[PDB]
Amino acid sequence: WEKASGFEESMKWKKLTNAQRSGLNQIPNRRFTLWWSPTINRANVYVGFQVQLDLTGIFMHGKIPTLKISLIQIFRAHLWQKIHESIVMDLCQVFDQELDALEIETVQKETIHPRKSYKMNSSCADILLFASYKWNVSRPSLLADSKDVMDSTTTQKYWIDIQLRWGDYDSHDIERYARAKFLDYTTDNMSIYPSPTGVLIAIDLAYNLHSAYGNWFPGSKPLIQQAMAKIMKANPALYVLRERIRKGLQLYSSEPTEPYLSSQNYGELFSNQIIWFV
Amino acid sequence: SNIYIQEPPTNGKVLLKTTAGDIDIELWSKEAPKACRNFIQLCLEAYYDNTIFHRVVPGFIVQGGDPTGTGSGGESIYGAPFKDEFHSRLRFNRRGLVAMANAGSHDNGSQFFFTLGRADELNNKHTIFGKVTGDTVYNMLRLSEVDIDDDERPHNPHKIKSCEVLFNPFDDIIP
Amino acid sequence: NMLNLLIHRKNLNYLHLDYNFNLKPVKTLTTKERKKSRFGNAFHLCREVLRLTKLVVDSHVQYRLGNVDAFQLADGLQYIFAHVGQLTGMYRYKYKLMRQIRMCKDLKHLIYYRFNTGPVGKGPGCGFWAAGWRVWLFFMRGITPLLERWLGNLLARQFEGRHSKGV
Amino acid sequence: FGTVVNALGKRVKPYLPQICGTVLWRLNNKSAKVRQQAADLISRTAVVMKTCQEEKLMGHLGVVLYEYLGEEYPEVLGSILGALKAIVNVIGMHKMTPPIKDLLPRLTPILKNRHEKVQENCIDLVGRIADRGAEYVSAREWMRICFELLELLKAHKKAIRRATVNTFGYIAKAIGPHDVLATLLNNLKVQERQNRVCTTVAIAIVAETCSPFTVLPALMNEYRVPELNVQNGVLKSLSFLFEYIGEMGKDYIYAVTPLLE
Amino acid sequence: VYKSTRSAKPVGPEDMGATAVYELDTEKERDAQAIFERSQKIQEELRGKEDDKIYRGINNYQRKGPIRAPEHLRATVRWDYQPDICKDYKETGFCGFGDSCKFLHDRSDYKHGWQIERELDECFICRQSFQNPVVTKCRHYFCESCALQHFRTTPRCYVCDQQTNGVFNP
Amino acid sequence: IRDVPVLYHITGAISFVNEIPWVIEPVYISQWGSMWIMMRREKRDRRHFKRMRFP
Amino acid sequence: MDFQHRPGGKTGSGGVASSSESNRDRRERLRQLALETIDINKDPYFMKNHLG
RNA sequence: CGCCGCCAAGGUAU
Numbered sequence A: 001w002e003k004a005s006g007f008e009e010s011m012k013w014k015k016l017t018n019a020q021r022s023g024l025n026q027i028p029n030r031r032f033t034l035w036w037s038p039t040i041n042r043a044n045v046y047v048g049f050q051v052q053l054d055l056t057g058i059f060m061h062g063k064i065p066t067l068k069i070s071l072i073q074i075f076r077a078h079l080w081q082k083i084h085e086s087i088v089m090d091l092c093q094v095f096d097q098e099l100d101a102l103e104i105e106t107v108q109k110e111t112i113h114p115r116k117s118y119k120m121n122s123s124c125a126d127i128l129l130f131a132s133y134k135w136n137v138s139r140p141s142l143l144a145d146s147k148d149v150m151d152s153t154t155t156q157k158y159w160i161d162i163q164l165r166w167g168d169y170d171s172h173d174i175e176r177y178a179r180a181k182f183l184d185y186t187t188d189n190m191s192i193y194p195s196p197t198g199v200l201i202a203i204d205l206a207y208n209l210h211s212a213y214g215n216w217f218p219g220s221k222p223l224i225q226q227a228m229a230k231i232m233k234a235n236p237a238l239y240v241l242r243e244r245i246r247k248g249l250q251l252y253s254s255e256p257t258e259p260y261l262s263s264q265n266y267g268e269l270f271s272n273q274i275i276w277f278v
Numbered sequence B: 001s002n003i004y005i006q007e008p009p010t011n012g013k014v015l016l017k018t019t020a021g022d023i024d025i026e027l028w029s030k031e032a033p034k035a036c037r038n039f040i041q042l043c044l045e046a047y048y049d050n051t052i053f054h055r056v057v058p059g060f061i062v063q064g065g066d067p068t069g070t071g072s073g074g075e076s077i078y079g080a081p082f083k084d085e086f087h088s089r090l091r092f093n094r095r096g097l098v099a100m101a102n103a104g105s106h107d108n109g110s111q112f113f114f115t116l117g118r119a120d121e122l123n124n125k126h127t128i129f130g131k132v133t134g135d136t137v138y139n140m141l142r143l144s145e146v147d148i149d150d151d152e153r154p155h156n157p158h159k160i161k162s163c164e165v166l167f168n169p170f171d172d173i174i175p
Numbered sequence C: 001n002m003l004n005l006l007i008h009r010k011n012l013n014y015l016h017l018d019y020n021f022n023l024k025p026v027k028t029l030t031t032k033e034r035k036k037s038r039f040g041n042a043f044h045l046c047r048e049v050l051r052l053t054k055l056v057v058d059s060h061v062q063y064r065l066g067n068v069d070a071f072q073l074a075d076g077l078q079y080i081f082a083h084v085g086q087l088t089g090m091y092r093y094k095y096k097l098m099r100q101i102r103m104c105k106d107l108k109h110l111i112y113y114r115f116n117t118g119p120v121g122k123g124p125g126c127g128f129w130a131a132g133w134r135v136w137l138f139f140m141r142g143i144t145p146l147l148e149r150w151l152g153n154l155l156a157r158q159f160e161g162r163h164s165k166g167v
Numbered sequence D: 001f002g003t004v005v006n007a008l009g010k011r012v013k014p015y016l017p018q019i020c021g022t023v024l025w026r027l028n029n030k031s032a033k034v035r036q037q038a039a040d041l042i043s044r045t046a047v048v049m050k051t052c053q054e055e056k057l058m059g060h061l062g063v064v065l066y067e068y069l070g071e072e073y074p075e076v077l078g079s080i081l082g083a084l085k086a087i088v089n090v091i092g093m094h095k096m097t098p099p100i101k102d103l104l105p106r107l108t109p110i111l112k113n114r115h116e117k118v119q120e121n122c123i124d125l126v127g128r129i130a131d132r133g134a135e136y137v138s139a140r141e142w143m144r145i146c147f148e149l150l151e152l153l154k155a156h157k158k159a160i161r162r163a164t165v166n167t168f169g170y171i172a173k174a175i176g177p178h179d180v181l182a183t184l185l186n187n188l189k190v191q192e193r194q195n196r197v198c199t200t201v202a203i204a205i206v207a208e209t210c211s212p213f214t215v216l217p218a219l220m221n222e223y224r225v226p227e228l229n230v231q232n233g234v235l236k237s238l239s240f241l242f243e244y245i246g247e248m249g250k251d252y253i254y255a256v257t258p259l260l261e
Numbered sequence E: 001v002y003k004s005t006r007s008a009k010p011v012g013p014e015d016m017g018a019t020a021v022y023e024l025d026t027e028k029e030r031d032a033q034a035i036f037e038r039s040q041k042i043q044e045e046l047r048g049k050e051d052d053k054i055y056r057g058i059n060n061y062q063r064k065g066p067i068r069a070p071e072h073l074r075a076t077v078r079w080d081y082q083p084d085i086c087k088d089y090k091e092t093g094f095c096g097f098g099d100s101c102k103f104l105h106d107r108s109d110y111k112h113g114w115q116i117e118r119e120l121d122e123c124f125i126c127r128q129s130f131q132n133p134v135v136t137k138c139r140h141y142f143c144e145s146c147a148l149q150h151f152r153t154t155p156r157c158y159v160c161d162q163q164t165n166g167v168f169n170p
Numbered sequence F: 001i002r003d004v005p006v007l008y009h010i011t012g013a014i015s016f017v018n019e020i021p022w023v024i025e026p027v028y029i030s031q032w033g034s035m036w037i038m039m040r041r042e043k044r045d046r047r048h049f050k051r052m053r054f055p
Numbered sequence G: 001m002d003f004q005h006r007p008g009g010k011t012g013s014g015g016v017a018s019s020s021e022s023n024r025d026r027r028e029r030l031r032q033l034a035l036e037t038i039d040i041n042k043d044p045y046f047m048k049n050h051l052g
Numbered sequence H: 001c002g003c004c005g006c007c008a009a010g011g012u013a014u
């Protein structure tokens, strides 16, 4: 915890006119409110009026000003859309392997539309995959399964869109959040999707983990599972939001060497999913 | 959920086959009786056979229902064109809608158009009488190609090969 | 047509009062337009009671669309008459009705734990709605002259101006 | 480590993700004063990553060192500013993911820190911005920092006091030598040394960087003010003026001869 | 092409959204309230048993916690546009309150949401034909006889009076 | 439906409904008891229930 | 927070300067003090030169 | 024998 200049013997001999001398320090009162964030902001005690800020999706269940100020310092300068553009750049660059599937002609990044990353009532597709003929898609399902019955309509193109959310301790199950959101947008009439087929990917920023819900061609699921585990392992925007939380919260490690985390399978065993050894 | 489809329920459905594919148009027969009546009558007469799509404005409209292919041939089964039938819940806020093409006053016949996007300039000016069931809206999104050669009338316009009637209320006859 | 035309007369043009009766700014208000546009209890409490009757009439017109039956509307407006505060924000500018919310929240158990006697079921279907209905009629029965006088004072303060150093 | 990576160059290519991950994990470390070593290590490894064709990880750590400068330790903050300085040196300034549009306003509260290493690295980065990035502002910031650069003086290292006059000169090259001029002449009634001669040198640098005859009439005018310090300041500024210009004083000898008499 | 199913039923449900389920969180039989209810129930049944070591699961060695969302409800969302920004620290660089001010101390002057909303909605001497267009020392394309008469007029050029020095080339 | 009288303004300012409820009490209690029994038997014969989507 | 019983301040102030401007204003204030005391005492022999 | 369920003015000047 906090160690940097706590006693502060001689700060630097400035003037300290009225309020910075005698007034209370606001940064511990905001980092403590930042520290219990999903259980000061939980969604299901009063489920009525929620007030989401600009460019964010926190929804702020309550009229708390200190939590709103402590959460906007960690969503400071367009980094929601930066996470959007960064992960869609990652999962459009990873599809340069085109012939490992059936065939992939191009991977079109569509028109960069602002307000798309946090629009919760309507949505559009983020990138699109074209083909020559007859991608045999499956029934829409999660990524935690392995069955892949694959009996549906042979289609041409395949859209992929990503989604973002924030914790709140009562709704952290994005295997159901992605499914409910994909059902809502496939029953919506405001959609300008290029197909009703393609997958909706939902990642959970607070309590960071990943899921998706859509139909799958054979060269799609086990590729992008490891490919987005690589996104969760290496990403500029989704890590500078973490170190911005660290600069707004004062968390520090006390070890001399790296805590055994690498590309080994040991490291995603403790991602609150149940994995057994036989 | 919070999607809020924002439309009255439908009654009556027809199938329409073009070279671009199959389109299942479901109508609002209660909210628009005369326009849906003219539409199901002209579908039952097999009147839209060899009818081409003569106007394409990409993102805005794609027009059909012209047996001549010039933009002025429209003949209702009423003898005269009929009235405009508006609805506050039926507006042009999305794609996939079908509306009778109009030129000012109460002049509606066989001449209609599919929507391709947000069409707020057409509100309280045209009679919305039907939509298209999704998983089949891309057969009419294939109708919007940039091959137009002009403001309208591309090289090879798609023609309607058949028009089936899946549900038929208020029983009618072909003459 | 009156709660939006108050805003249209007072030359705001940035509060988007919607049909489900809420209120939202749009423009990240500066000081000369924040202090001009904030309302007291007479505007806001009337807005919440109109939102309550808006949800009631939306329930009735949802019934008469023809896609929902009578028992489901019964459990629905029972939940509406029993769980205000959770979904209307009417306690925010008048706290005295909060006890009445508790007066609803208690009596529902008198209802809800007498459906469950015997082999009936734990799930919803609690459509005995008259008891919360009577007490939120008792609310408006005593609050109608109160915010009637408050909105009359509001119309006096808006249309013939204020009195700075009168009374 | 710097000599090793400079001798390696291209051959250290399957080692930079491991080393940079060790640095990015190392950069918290209890805040028990083991954090300036990682930032100094970044400032050493700034050179060898450009010669190894690696700019994506430069863009990765630029937005890391953009907001690891919110420190309370000055010994860590000086190394953070030195690492960001080395980033701005080895990379072209208009192609960095912490752009100058929002980096210098983050440097301006760091300027009000009275630690000498923080001041040195801060005003060196400010001078690099002032001679190579003067188009990323709203033209009001270079005018509101030159008053703070007066309080940046009386620092006892002689490197800060020789860099800050160059920052004044490039500020006046950016936004014209007519508004910072009144600031440098108002810095001539202090009663303290190392603050009136260090703005005398600034009057010399605003005289010599941009063209002459923009500072000389007001410098002649301030001798009419009946104070000892402003007259000694304008005379010593004429001394450093002719010392810095040399051969360009052939036209101005007849103008300052009635002042020297 | 996308072939149809050839049915008379419309595109979706009959209620047109009157039974929204709101299944964003963990569903009913798998929620932590249901797990606590199962644990409480099985602790109520096994009472005469004293450590039968069939062990029943993790929490059964001997409604709070994650509470169930109301399935019959959307949360009424509002757009909180209004930021809390230290303006005297943003556009100036010195807040008078120091660390005692309740606002953010931000200096990123980027665009807000409403700004994005209202931005997204919108020869030559004789003036004749080129009779042998020929050049001089300094790119000046002239004619032949016209530039000869020009040299008879003045020994320099016409555009910028350049010293031709008797040098005239094609 | 409950058709009802009203008292409204010419310009459409406000439409006062002018009717006092006027229900006799034993038929009132018997109607509420009848719908109580029918609604218990309705909830007993439902597999699961979804309430309104209240906005 | 107690917004009414806190040590307050006005927005857009800028604060107060360092030692240099403070003792500059102190010396100018002592100059005005000396001039007003010799104005009351009426001293005709006190004179300031061209250098302060 | 089982309290308690919170809005706003107070700050980014006129």
Ligand SMILES: O=P(O)(O)O[C@H]1[C@H](OP(=O)(O)O)[C@H](OP(=O)(O)O)[C@H](OP(=O)(O)O)[C@@H](OP(=O)(O)O)[C@H]1OP(=O)(O)O
Residues within 6 Å of the ligand: C079, C083, C105, C112, C122, C123, C124, C126, E070
């Ligand atoms: O959580 P409990 O204390 O056990 O009481 C709950 C609760 O009623 P109250 O919180 O007002 O006492 C539910 O209402 P909510 O506040 O959770 O919305 C209500 O459901 P209804 O909204 O339909 O009235 C029903 O819970 P359930 O969903 O199981 O019917 C009820 O009693 P029980 O939980 O014992 O059934």
Ligand SMILES: [Mg+2]
Residues within 6 Å of the ligand: G008, G009, G010
């Ligand atoms: Mg005050």
Ligand SMILES: [Zn+2]
Residues within 6 Å of the ligand: E086, E087, E089, E095, E096, E097, E101, E102, E103, E104, E105
């Ligand atoms: Zn502040």
